[PDB]
Design a protein around this nucleic acid. Structure first.
Lengths: 100, 50, 151, 206
RNA sequence: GGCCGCAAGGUUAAAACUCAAAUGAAUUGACGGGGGCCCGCACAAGCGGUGGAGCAUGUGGUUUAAUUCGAUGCAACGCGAAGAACCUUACCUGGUCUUGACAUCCACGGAAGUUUUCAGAGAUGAGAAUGUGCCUUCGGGAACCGUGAGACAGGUGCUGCAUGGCUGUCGUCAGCUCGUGUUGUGAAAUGUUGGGUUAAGUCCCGCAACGAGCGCAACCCUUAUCCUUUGUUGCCAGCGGUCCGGCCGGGAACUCAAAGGAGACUGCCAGUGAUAAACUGGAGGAAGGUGGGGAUGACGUCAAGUCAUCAUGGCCCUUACGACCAGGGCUACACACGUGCUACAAUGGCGCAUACAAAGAGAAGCGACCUCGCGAGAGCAAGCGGACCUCAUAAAGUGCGUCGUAGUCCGGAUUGGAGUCUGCAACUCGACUCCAUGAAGUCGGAAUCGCUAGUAAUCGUGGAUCAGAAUGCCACGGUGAAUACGU
């Protein structure tokens, strides 16, 4: 990928770590029943002033060696191509070709 | 296994995990000391419960 | 095939009576791996057919088949650029197979209310020498007779 | 057609792994990334010490790294002054206690990685590729192997049409799973583009 | 032009101009509507589909500000995509920056928590509080935030006809070659052909050949039958307690779990055959002649695919083809094609109520019991990093009623109203629930595809990507056929 995309990813992760607790509090306010019914309106209006990049759902998994946004596996942190390269070189403990 | 189109031509891999369980019925102080003062290989994961 | 010999598969006999012919019939009637339904239909049909003629189910079935078993048929040959019908003899296993197949195909095209009723009607008509099964036998025999010159 | 990787198809039958540790799903990825960075650093730093293999182990909360080399003197240095620096940097990268061991390769002429590295180095200084390949094969068969194969591909000699050539001597049975075959590769960057090298070496059945 | 002939014509016989070749005999291939032998769901014998309808999805074309780029006979078209509402994003319109959003250098001062106005936001301005560590021999500045100048950074921009690495296909076909010797002036040949046999350049016997290599078989995984070890979380024939339930005390026998071993070799019997290699039968045995299923892809062909995973030669732009930001588009619609799902009904639809599996996943996770709602769901809360808890109730099936051949009590497109959940945010453009509406279609022209046994056909179950979004892809079991005379 380009150099700017990984920069975007790092920025997103940082902000999402920074603003975690505030969002949890506001969402507890909005979700909980028997609330004042005006604190609800104020909280809904306030949750949209925090920066957009602070929501965990704006993040996209990428391979840690190249940056590819498609074909990602979670157990290994890499894409299919690099998984196969490492596997044949012998660098993934326990992995081997399977038949049955 | 191809960097572009071809949609057949796949590879299938496997990982296996082996598990064992051992019971000690009447531990003594010397036994617990001996156990806790042991070291084993670097590919074996050991968990001890009282 | 080209260089193969194929053996014969064993077939379990029916549970009510003990005939492999009826088992082959049930097999030829079944669809989509539902053997119990086919067994129900066949047994109901034989029950409703035994009364009409006052004889055992096996005897009625045999009588029905003996009027649809064929003897000669026609194959197609083309070596000189033209298609010729050549008459050949049929062997007993193929006789039985063709008879059952034609019976079932004729039954499926009728217009009664249930499959058991249609099958019983077809079997009775065949015993009486009427219906599409006997018509098919006659047509095949006519076609075989019309081409005796090519034997 | 296409061929299967010899090392990969043989793992678990006659060949050992290069990393031996257990982990769970929340540490697997991070362990792999750390290993990749350690290997990258060491390979860059010891570029002239004839390194062929790095074996990594992770016990307890520590990392221990074994380097296989054919020139231990250059790596160790004057009473360890270089091994110490390596250990410090590796511990900084791994984030835990670190330990380093050195093992010696007796015969460099029967190791696949070093042969390929030598051929690539020669090609970069404008040597004849036929000369390089024939020398490699002759040395291997002289020092006691049971078979060798060498292959070279690219814009050989400055040509405009690419090409591929290979040489062989002895036995190299690739469909036999109990045969002990060593395989590895290397790349050369010339003034006309990339050239690739592959080396197969046979040693006997097990 | 002369000579001859009734004629048709015969005989003697040039030049201008134009090209760099035209030709004989043999050699290795490829091809034949030439011959001979042999194989494969190739035909034949059979069972179920596609081509017609409605919907899902990819492609061509047309349209638009933009509808981002790539794949194109078999061997592109549910293909890169294992999951486009913003992000992803590479495309369009408008607002902005210039040593730069991402690294190395120099020198001028200082670092993170909360909170106020103006912007769609990027981004400008006011404030309040704090003084970190650490040879301070004062030079530490490591750690990390500012501005300033120039070496530089940056490019999903072009060429896969400059390349490395990786992949498709002929083809899981049985072939493809070398050293020494001998033959021919030579290109080359022999070996590798011949008589038998096999799934097989598999094996034997002959022969100017004698030997070796890459392929074929075998060593690797799984499945089916046994005995020896260890028995919790898994198992209950005998024994003995009863609130009936492996519950409780117990037992190590059986299912089962996972480490070591045994077994199948044409090994034994009869016949045929060159006193061979083999072939057709039989005994025992869980299994018989490659027992069934995988992985494993020879020298090479198609300037086959990929500079948009990654790396790289050469070219091109640097206040712009490099940065950042909110809205839109990749989801358009006269039409043409490929791949699928649901049906066109009594071997069936609807209502009651009752047997029998396998393999998997789970801490920003899987969510029992209880209560509330017609329902999707909501509240309060045990257990579980797991042979223990949770996802989790298999369906087709069997038993009893109703419907009686109707565009129907078959089918479930489209559209109106009211809701639930994830997420800052569901207009363009999400999945699901309730009430209502109830379209096409009665088995599909010329063509054309899959399958040889636990196979086709039919019924249910799980996982990867993933906040949410499968009728696709990859895996698991239940019921269970028809036909092979022959080339």
């Amino acid at each position: 990928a380009k150099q700017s995309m990984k920069a975007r990813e790092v920025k997103r992760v940082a902000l999402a770590d920074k603003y975690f607790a505030k969002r949890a509090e506001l969402k507890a306010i909005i979700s909980d029943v028997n609330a004042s019914d005006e604190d609800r309106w104020n909280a809904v209006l306030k949750l949209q002033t925090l920066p957009r990049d602070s929501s965990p759902s704006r993040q996209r998994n990428r391979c840690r060696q190249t940056g590819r946004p498609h074909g990602f596996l979670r157990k290994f942190g890499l894409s299919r191509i690099k998984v196969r390269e490492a596997a044949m070189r012998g660098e993934i403990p326990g992995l081997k070709k399977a038949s049955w | 296994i191809s960097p572009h189109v071809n949609k057949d031509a796949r590879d299938q891999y496997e990982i296996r995990t082996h598990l064992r369980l051992v019971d000690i019925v009447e531990p003594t102080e010397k036994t617990v000391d001996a156990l806790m003062r042991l070291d084993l290989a670097a590919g074996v994961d050991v968990q001890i419960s009282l | 095939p080209r260089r193969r010999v194929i053996g014969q598969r064993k077939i379990l006999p029916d549970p009510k009576f003990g005939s492999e012919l009826l088992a082959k019939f049930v097999n030829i009637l079944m669809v989509d791996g539902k053997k119990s339904t086919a067994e129900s239909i066949v047994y109901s049909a034989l029950e409703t057919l035994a009364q009409r003629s006052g004889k055992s189910e096996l005897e009625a079935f045999e009588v029905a088949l003996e009027n649809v078993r064929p003897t000669v048929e026609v194959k197609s040959r083309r070596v000189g650029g033209s298609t010729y019908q050549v008459p050949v003899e049929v062997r007993p296993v193929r006789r039985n197979a063709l008879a059952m197949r034609w019976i079932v195909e004729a039954a499926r095209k009728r217009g009664d209310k249930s499959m058991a009723l249609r099958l019983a009607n077809e079997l009775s008509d065949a015993a009486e020498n009427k219906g599409t099964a006997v018509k098919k036998r006659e047509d095949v025999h006519r076609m075989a007779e019309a081409n005796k010159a090519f034997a | 057609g296409q061929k299967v990787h010899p090392n990969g198809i043989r793992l678990g039958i006659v060949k050992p792994w290069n990393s031996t540790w257990f982990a769970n799903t929340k540490e697997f990825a991070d362990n792999l990334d750390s290993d990749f960075k350690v290997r990258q650093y060491l390979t860059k730093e010891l570029a002239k010490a004839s390194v062929s293999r790095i074996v990594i182990e992770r016990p307890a909360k520590s990392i221990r790294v074994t380097i296989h080399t054919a020139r231990p003197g250059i790596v160790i240095g004057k009473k360890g002054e270089d091994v110490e620096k390596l250990r410090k940097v590796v511990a900084d990268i791994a984030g835990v206690p670190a330990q380093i061991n050195i093992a010696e390769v007796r015969k460099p002429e029967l190791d696949a990685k070093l042969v390929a590295d030598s051929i690539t180095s020669q090609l970069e200084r404008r040597v004849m590729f036929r000369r390089a390949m024939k020398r490699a094969v002759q040395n291997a068969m002289r020092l006691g192997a049971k078979g060798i194969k060498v292959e070279v591909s690219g814009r050989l000699g400055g040509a405009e049409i690419a090409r591929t050539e290979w040489y062989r001597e002895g036995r190299v049975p690739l469909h036999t799973l109990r045969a002990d075959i060593d395989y590895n590769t290397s790349e050369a960057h010339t003034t006309y583009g990339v050239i690739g090298v592959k080396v197969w070496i046979f040693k006997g059945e097990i």
